């Protein structure tokens, strides 16, 4: 459940975006969207908790947004450290949270 | 406020009458509460004391 | 005891309601609050209650 693109790429120094989309119930009803980074073979990491707020330790390169039944992360100032998978998890059905399939980032 | 997400289910009784009652609480449990500012209430009891 | 967890305020009551057809009764339930519910008389403190 919940749709996400498969992959995205760009050169160093560029900025890219990763999008997530769901029904009017999951993402359209609440501002509860969070983005998790995962390097391969590692536990995920914690990037964005509410749709456009960061925790401590996360760079300002990352920022999020919402529009209607869809939301998207923004990665700015690309470098080799940003080569990792990114998943979105958002408020789901009744009292649940549903997570997307994930997007891979390739820095040329 | 009443934080919890009550549902509502109808019980058919007799010729066409229905009786609506809670069916489930799809979420977590809560406390019903009412909030008042402490500063404003202190003012509104100080002035009532003066008057 | 909604979903492995206790709720202190609401009782899950089950009662035999009458369908549209006078002959056939149906077993039905609904979550009644406390205050609305009182223990029933002439029983040895069992789980029998009334409105």
């Amino acid at each position: 459940a919940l749709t996400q693109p498969a992959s995205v790429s760009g050169s160093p120094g560029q900025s890219i975006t990763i999008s997530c989309t769901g029904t009017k119930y999951d993402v359209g009803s609440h501002d509860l969207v969070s983005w998790y980074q995962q390097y391969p073979g590692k536990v995920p990491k914690y990037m964005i908790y509410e749709v456009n707020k960061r925790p401590s330790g996360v760079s300002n390169r990352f920022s999020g947004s919402k529009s209607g039944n869809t939301a998207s992360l923004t990665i700015s100032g690309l470098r080799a450290e940003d080569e990792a998978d990114y998943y979105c998890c958002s408020f789901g059905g009744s009292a649940t949270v549903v997570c997307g399939g994930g997007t891979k980032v390739t820095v040329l | 406020t009443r934080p919890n997400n009550n549902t509502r289910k109808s019980v058919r009784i007799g010729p066409g009458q229905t009786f609506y009652a809670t069916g489930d609480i799809i979420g977590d449990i809560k406390q019903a509460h009412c909030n008042i500012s402490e500063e404003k209430w202190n003012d509104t009891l100080q002035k009532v004391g003066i008057e | 005891t909604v979903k492995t967890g206790t709720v202190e305020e609401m009782k899950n009551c089950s009662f035999n309601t009458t369908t549209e057809i006078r002959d056939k009764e149906k077993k039905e339930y609904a979550l009644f609050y406390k205050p609305d519910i009182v223990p029933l008389s002439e029983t040895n403190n069992t789980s029998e209650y009334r409105l």
Partner: nanobody
Amino acid sequence: QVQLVQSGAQMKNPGASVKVSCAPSGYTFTDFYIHWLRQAPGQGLQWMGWMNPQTGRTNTARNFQGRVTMTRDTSIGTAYMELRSLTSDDTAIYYCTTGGWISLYYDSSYYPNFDHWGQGTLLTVS
């Protein structure tokens, strides 16, 4: 800092059922929800259920209704998750994660704020 310890790797035949265990450290156990997550090998994250350690209330996704049950022991300071009717497709990494903050006045259960993640444990069905 805070750490979430989990059980070691597991191996099973189909239909055996497994009770995975989690043990948070560094914060009061009953101050934050516990959210259970799954990651099949090569697949994306999937959400299983959340738990209220203060009162044991829990909820699970529609595709695990009855198939999964989770409980806890506040004295030990640990949480358990029983998965039932194992198939070969249940081979996955299982994560124990720290959710929102419990409070009596607003439902923070469904908030996707997984602040701290367990090390993850591999369950194998074959």
